[PDB]
Amino acid sequence: SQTQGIQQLLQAEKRAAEKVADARKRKARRLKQAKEEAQMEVEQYRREREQEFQSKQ
Amino acid sequence: ALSDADVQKQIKHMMAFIEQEANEKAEEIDAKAEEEFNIEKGRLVQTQRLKIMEYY
Amino acid sequence: SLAEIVKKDDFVLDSEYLVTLLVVVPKLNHNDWIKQYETLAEMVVPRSSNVLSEDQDSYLCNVTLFRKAVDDFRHKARENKFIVRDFQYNEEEMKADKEEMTRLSTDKK
What we know:
The structure is cut from a larger assembly and holds chains A (57 residues), B (56 residues) and C (109 residues).
Chain A: H1 4-56
Chain B: H1 5-55
Chain C: E1 18-26, H1 30-36, E2 50-54, E3 58-66, H2 70-79, E4 83-84, H3 91-108
Antiparallel strand pairs in C: 1-3, 1-4, 2-3
């Protein structure tokens, strides 16, 4: 590898780092999405429980 | 006599794992992002649901 | 000591995958090493060879090549009667040696 191989290696490493970093950022945002969606789910569960409380009362 | 054929042989040897193993690392990071969807949703808000159930 | 031989321009430092190696080579096999070093290892850089320095019996020559292929590079180099002078760019050592030499000379005076 005189010059072509070094160029291809550099692009390969840059793309690899981009893949890993993008996956990490996706994971972070997706964890935030998990927390938000499940918070809404628990809000719905709370609404159900309050309705049942009203019926019981 | 090597010319650029030997260069391309080493590049065929090298690229196909240096780029693809990082791709697989990205894919398993996403898979663990799904597993952590599940872990967060079954631990944090699960404890929250248990607390409110205790209150109820 | 390589206190007064190497230079930073001969080294490809801080690279991701490549490194400069130093190899003493006999005069009788200098051109032979130049024609053979591209074949001495794979993932090497043709036309990266150079004559860093010389003496009355050999040539200290530097080559840029892959870090994984250095093992077989030095192996085949030993197969072709070339002794690898293992040393990387260390300005600290060189300046320390020069300054210590001058310091002890002046101290003795």
